[PDB]
Amino acid sequence: MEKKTIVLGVIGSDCHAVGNKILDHAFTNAGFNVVNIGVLSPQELFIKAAIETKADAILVSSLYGQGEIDCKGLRQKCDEAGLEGILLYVGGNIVVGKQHWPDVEKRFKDMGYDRVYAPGTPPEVGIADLKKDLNIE
Amino acid sequence: MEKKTIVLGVIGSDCHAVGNKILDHAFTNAGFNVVNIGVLSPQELFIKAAIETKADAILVSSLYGQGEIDCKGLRQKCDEAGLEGILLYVGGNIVVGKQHWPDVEKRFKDMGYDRVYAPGTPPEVGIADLKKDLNIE
Amino acid sequence: MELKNKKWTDEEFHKQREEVLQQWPTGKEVDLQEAVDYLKKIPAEKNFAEKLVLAKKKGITMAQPRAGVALLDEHIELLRYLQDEGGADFLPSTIDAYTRQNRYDECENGIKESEKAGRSLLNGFPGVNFGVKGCRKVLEAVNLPLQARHGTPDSRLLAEIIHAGGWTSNEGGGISYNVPYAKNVTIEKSLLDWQYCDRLVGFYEEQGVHINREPFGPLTGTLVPPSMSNAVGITEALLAAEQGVKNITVGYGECGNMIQDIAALRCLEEQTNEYLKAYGYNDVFVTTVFHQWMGGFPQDESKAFGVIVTATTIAALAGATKVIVKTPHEAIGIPTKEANAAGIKATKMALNMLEGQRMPMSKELETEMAVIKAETKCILDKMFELGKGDLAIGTVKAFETGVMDIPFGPSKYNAGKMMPVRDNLGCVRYLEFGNVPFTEEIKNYNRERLQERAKFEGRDVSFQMVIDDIFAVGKGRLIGRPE
Amino acid sequence: MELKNKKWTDEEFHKQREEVLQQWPTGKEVDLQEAVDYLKKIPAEKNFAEKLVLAKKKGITMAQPRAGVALLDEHIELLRYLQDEGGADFLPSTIDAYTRQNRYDECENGIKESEKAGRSLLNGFPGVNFGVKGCRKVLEAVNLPLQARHGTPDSRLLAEIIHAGGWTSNEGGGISYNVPYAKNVTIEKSLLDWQYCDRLVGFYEEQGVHINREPFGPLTGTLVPPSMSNAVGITEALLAAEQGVKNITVGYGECGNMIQDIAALRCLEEQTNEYLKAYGYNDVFVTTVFHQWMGGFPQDESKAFGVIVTATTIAALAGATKVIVKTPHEAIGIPTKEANAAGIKATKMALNMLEGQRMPMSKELETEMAVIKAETKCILDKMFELGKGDLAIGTVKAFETGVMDIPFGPSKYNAGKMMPVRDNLGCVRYLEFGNVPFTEEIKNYNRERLQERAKFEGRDVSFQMVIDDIFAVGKGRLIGRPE
Ligand code: COB
Ligand code: COB
Known part of the structure; x- marks a missing residue:
């Protein structure tokens, strides 16, 4: 809807790239300015980009399973960088193995993530949520 | 092994025949005189053969699912025919569907069957059970 | 009646019908005039014969399970699950085994007992006891074509009821629903009673109603050589076409060697068409059904999927019009709706993973097809000889002489050599x-x-x-x- | 070091070794003289290269899963389940992704967190942190050959440790363990570092110790055309042979059209052998690995079995020496031992259901093989030209010029055109x-x-x-x- 800016990438030692390209394509198609930092990205690159570009949200993708380690501490660091209240989304395959989804969702919300997505989430769900959260729907 | 006689068949409206041929061969190879009345056999033919041949045991195979109906009352009839105490075995796929085995075994034992066998029983097991029950093992 | 391979006249057929309908009180529910109007109002999407034509037209393989329980509402809940959660393309109604011996008395006790037990004590659906009214309830509650699948030497009343019931396919034949299923029924009598079943379909076609017939390919499901199996299917097709049948699915049961199996189904289809036209039946629409492994299954469910999906791959590359689905419960018992849906989901996935793919011709395939056609013609040739040109009489004499012989068949009329x-x-x-x-x-x-x-x-x-x-x-x- | 496609000298190699072993304190556990004697005492049944020869000779396809967790005892329990309950023919140890970026610090943290949580927080086994000691305990606890499966641009220390650890195969290549797995690593440096890995195996072979190497065929697992995939594997096979490797498994990832996939596997094998001999490597034993569908899976587990077993059918008819097993948990997360064993059991059932069966030659297969060989030769010919006869330099220039281009590769050195x-x-x-x-x-x-x-x-x-x-x-x- 409106020309909002998001930061998009894949965190930690994760090289999975196909979803990242689809996400970029879909969010771009939806009207967003996508700052795509790509794969194998540590937390600091998400924050640097968000500042540089005055992003409205950071979409963290995590597929390879070690997101439960990699995703800890992002909110704190965003706050310290002066990005208090920015929207924080995380999706993909964020934990190792099949688990009970509600327990997982809680776990990442407890880390400071605004929204948490399960395996196989269509981009259209995240686009709709983000338009809502940004009051542009 | 010492030479005993058994009656063998498939009960009711059940046409399954391959298992019957294997059981015949195996029990025969084990040293039994197998009186094979074949498929689609009502209760009475099992009893008629047992008397005619002074059988030591009656092996009822039931594969098609309706054994829970077909098998009831056999002990009763054998008793009334003067075959009190004869060994009654039942096996194959004796109930409709996958079920909790301990529940099934008790049901058929409560019907008067001496031994009750689950799907996929090797002939070899019944052969062993029968020599033991006939004190010839 | 005397057996001869000639279409029954309308008078003869009618005299038999009046007898047959008296065999159980639900025969009073059958009204041929009324049944034609009912049948013609069924949408094409729910007509088995018409959907098969479409499948053929689009080059797709359609999937169909086995399924049936004693009670009507339960039976309907099961079929809906297979349709909606399983994704089936066609629905069965597997008839119980008491029905197959015409023991409707046993069926009735079975229904009562199932009611009391809260679970099916029958291994299928007692269609004759449920009558035209129940069979119609089934059809109206689903969105796919319906077919009776069973194994009944004398199926005349069942056929009257399920077709008046709006089921637009009947499986079976005079050989295939005798020899694997009966010990004491003559080949002559089952040929005669299946002539009635074919002739009823013939009647309906005469009125513009399209109804499929499927000879039962797999027979005893136990190492049946393709040439013997195909000789049986081709025969039943010819004998059905003589009584007026116009839509026929000939069948084959997986042996396991992909090339052998592909050869078998192509030979079956080709020679069925060839013989039909050689004997003047020029308006028969022929389709094929491949049955997944009809022998013993492994109990391990993962292993069972290995069988299900390898069998499906063979079917797909064979260009089968229809494939009959097995389940991970096959070694143990009649599947739950969830286990059946599983089998169907795995099958449909494999089919979609192989969209449009066909085995190409090779010297290997060529050689096996020549072999199977030659063996099959030896058998059929002899049959026509014994019958002095009548394939019906030739069939009887062929079984008498061991010319036709089905492995492990319990029929006393089968040579077993x-x-x-x-x-x-x-x-x-x-x-x-x-x-x-x-x-x-x-x-x-x-x-x-x-x-x-x-x-x-x-x-x-x-x-x-x-x-x-x-x-x-x-x-x-x-x-x-x-x- | 300068990059050339020439066998490193002994002195060359040694000086690199003494540098590499310092990259983590477990490097001190590697003693080459001691390791040769250890390796030579492993029974033939547990040597990966030797069992591959056996498979080839018997014309069988062998099955191998993916599997790995953070802690030593749990990982061994896992592999034991796959072997015993799964029936695997070969065992992996899938290395975690921090290891792959040489972040032994993060591996360390991951182990402590996994200990505390009672579950693996790592997506694989940190072989470098576990050392020779740990790697040998794994091997001694199992009864099948062991192979490191991973995706590591700089795998030099890892190689020293797992091989000294008794693992008799290492997966990877300078191209295939760079472009799908890295963003910032030059093709020259990963080629140089994989020269090390190959040269280590070359040392071992020169001592009489047989160790397998497996270039990673599927790359990004996402719509890779057979000719591009095959050019990579042929290239990695040649670059390995130059450093003294003698037992090589070239791989390919399922695209899904059976005829295309079988064409690809045969072209891969045929052209690998041809090229090897054309360049004078006359004593290299070549085998093939077919990976089941490496793209996105369906979440429904029954559907997943449909993918797993159709893929196995293709592998079997292709004559693959090895097939890598997927599981019904693929769309969701790293499989439990049960789900893994399920995938292995379905796979092996399919293989045994197809024992000795092969796709026969046809015009269609002939044509597709011709297309793939010609495409592949276009790419290799240009690579040799750009490198003025040196395939290693030709590989760098080809990535620079987009002559070699891997779909969806995250590497910035990949054209993406x-x-x-x-x-x-x-x-x-x-x-x-x-x-x-x-x-x-x-x-x-x-x-x-x-x-x-x-x-x-x-x-x-x-x-x-x-x-x-x-x-x-x-x-x-x-x-x-x-x-
Ligand atoms: C479009 C895209 C297609 N999907 C894919 O491209 C992934 C499919 C697949 C098969 C995974 C399984 C499967 N899904 O069936 C498997 N990989 Co890969 C074997 N892999 C690969 C492929 C990647 C090539 C590349 N560079 O891109 C490789 C073969 C190299 C590969 C390698 C690895 N892989 C690994 C693993 C473990 C996994 N891999 C997974 C992801 C999976 C689930 C497989 C499994 N199950 O075991 C593993 C993760 C397990 C877990 N979390 O427990 C590993 C270690 C090898 C192994 N053990 O199997 C290795 C690690 C490399 C690394 N350093 O990260 C692939 C292809 C896969 O979808 P997607 O799911 O990526 O994203 C998608 C996206 C676009 O539609 O929207 C969603 N989404 C994602 N993030 C976000 C959102 C949505 C919102 C709204 C967000 C805020 C964020 C949604 O998730
Ligand atoms: C050697 C022999 C091979 N096994 C077989 O020959 C049977 C395999 C198979 C696939 C069944 C599934 C499977 N097992 O994987 C299936 N049939 Co068949 C689809 N069937 C056929 C085949 C039979 C041909 C023939 N005339 O013989 C047909 C296609 C005609 C066929 C027909 C039917 N079948 C039917 C059914 C329901 C079943 N059929 C079963 C038996 C099974 C289990 C399949 C399923 N699952 O759904 C059904 C029973 C379910 C249940 N109990 O819940 C039905 C109605 C069609 C349908 N709905 O699927 C129909 C009914 C016909 C009838 N009137 O009875 C077959 C071949 C099977 O083993 P066996 O198990 O018969 O016997 C064996 C024996 C010898 O090794 O020792 C054991 N044993 C057996 N009895 C006894 C003992 C041991 C001892 C110690 C005893 C005292 C007794 C042991 O059980």
């Missing part, structure tokens, strides 16, 4: 020929293929190998190798 | 060629196949079809048809 066994690549061959009328050339090829197994295994081919092959898939492989 | 898409039969074709050096005739064949899909679907060939193809299997079918 021919013995099958696999070769070194798992193709089912003839080990003992009995009176099957093959040339020595044809016998020599079977022996040559089998000698290769002998050499590889270091043991003479024999009945022990037959036993080994009977247990092989259940123990985890196609070929019964020693150990 | 070539675009693949399926044709109307599901074969992966070239949509956009980029700088892939094909002749007009070769591009015209690709365009012609794809125009048939446009005609069937009623839409122009486009990136939207590529997107649809990326999601299609997870949505239930091979080809991304509209709707």
